[PDB]
Amino acid sequence: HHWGYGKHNGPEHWHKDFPIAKGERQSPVDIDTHTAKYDPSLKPLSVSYDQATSLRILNNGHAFNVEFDDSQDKAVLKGGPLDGTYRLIQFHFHWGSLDGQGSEHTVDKKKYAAELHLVHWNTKYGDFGKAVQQPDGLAVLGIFLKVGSAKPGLQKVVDVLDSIKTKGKSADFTNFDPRGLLPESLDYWTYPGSLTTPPLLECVTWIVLKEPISVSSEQVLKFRKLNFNGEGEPEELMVDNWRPAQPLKNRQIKASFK
Numbered sequence: 001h002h003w004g005y006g007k008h009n010g011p012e013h014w015h016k017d018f019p020i021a022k023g024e025r026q027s028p029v030d031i032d033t034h035t036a037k038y039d040p041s042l043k044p045l046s047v048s049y050d051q052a053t054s055l056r057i058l059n060n061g062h063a064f065n066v067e068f069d070d071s072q073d074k075a076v077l078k079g080g081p082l083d084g085t086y087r088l089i090q091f092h093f094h095w096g097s098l099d100g101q102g103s104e105h106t107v108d109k110k111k112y113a114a115e116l117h118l119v120h121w122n123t124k125y126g127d128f129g130k131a132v133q134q135p136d137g138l139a140v141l142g143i144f145l146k147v148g149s150a151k152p153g154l155q156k157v158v159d160v161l162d163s164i165k166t167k168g169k170s171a172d173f174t175n176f177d178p179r180g181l182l183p184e185s186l187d188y189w190t191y192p193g194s195l196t197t198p199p200l201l202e203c204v205t206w207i208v209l210k211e212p213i214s215v216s217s218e219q220v221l222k223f224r225k226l227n228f229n230g231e232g233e234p235e236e237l238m239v240d241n242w243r244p245a246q247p248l249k250n251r252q253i254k255a256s257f258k
């Protein structure tokens with residue numbers, strides 16, 4: 001009928017409509033810290049989120065997304081393993097029904113409670129739709145969320161979820177500052193991969209941050225109260241919207257730290 005994360009249309013079934021699911025550079029993967037190569041030539045990451053304009057938040061039946069105005073270079077990502085400027089277009093989360101699962105990427109087989117993806121596209125390509133047609137079209141900055149203390153920067157997002165409860169609802173979400181979702185250190189691992197949901201396009205340079213952010217259980221708890229279904233349909237709680245780790249194949253994960 002259409003992809004989802006349940007018994008009948010979950011990740012295991014995705015390959016039927018999206019053949020690329022069994023490709024060479026699929027994500028997410030398991031980061032084995034003892035095999036990752038320290039690379040002294042990688043540049044430090046440069047995140048310029050000082051003029052970001054958030055527009056709205058919407059429930060799309062797969063997760064919730066905060067969209068930004070990417071008409072010009074207001075919020076960008078440069079440095080690290082990248083070439084050229086990438087524009088912030090949207091961020092979303094993946095989470096679980098329990099605190100010991102939720103993240104897509106794992107560290108030494110360790111699963112975190114949730115995972116934040118800040119999606120950017122390569123400006124040299126003109127618009128998002130063109131960028132998705134290239135090997136170095138996307139750069140997704142991933143951050144792990146660990147349950148502990150509350151993150152002030154996340155509360156604004158948490159407070160508005162009630163107005164976008166079911167599939168297809170949206171609420172205006174202006175003046176949100178993304179810099180509030182960053183950890184202290186910008187150290188990372190990097191590898192060539194893909195989107196973690198259909199169409200599963202292999203156009204992503206993944207930059208996973210080493211240091212996770214803290215989020216209270218009450219904050220994550222509100223994520224689990226969202227709905228996969230639209231208004232009027234039977235209720236199905238939005239939880240465990242994450243894809244299992246894929247085989248690394250012939251790839252190498254470089255670390256920007258020792």
Ligand SMILES: NS(=O)(=O)c1cc2c(s1)S(=O)(=O)N(c1cccc(O)c1)C(CN1CCOCC1)=C2
Nearest residue numbers: 065089090117119132140194195196197198199
């Ligand atoms: N989890 S993830 O980081 O690996 C991403 C999954 C998707 C990302 S990133 S996305 O931002 O690139 N894109 C997306 C999602 C919501 C809004 C938007 O403008 C784009 C879609 C749906 N998208 C339709 C057009 O072709 C590519 C895929 C899925």
Ligand SMILES: [Hg+2]
Nearest residue numbers: 133134202203
């Ligand atoms: Hg691509």
Ligand SMILES: [Zn+2]
Nearest residue numbers: 092094117196
């Ligand atoms: Zn994602």
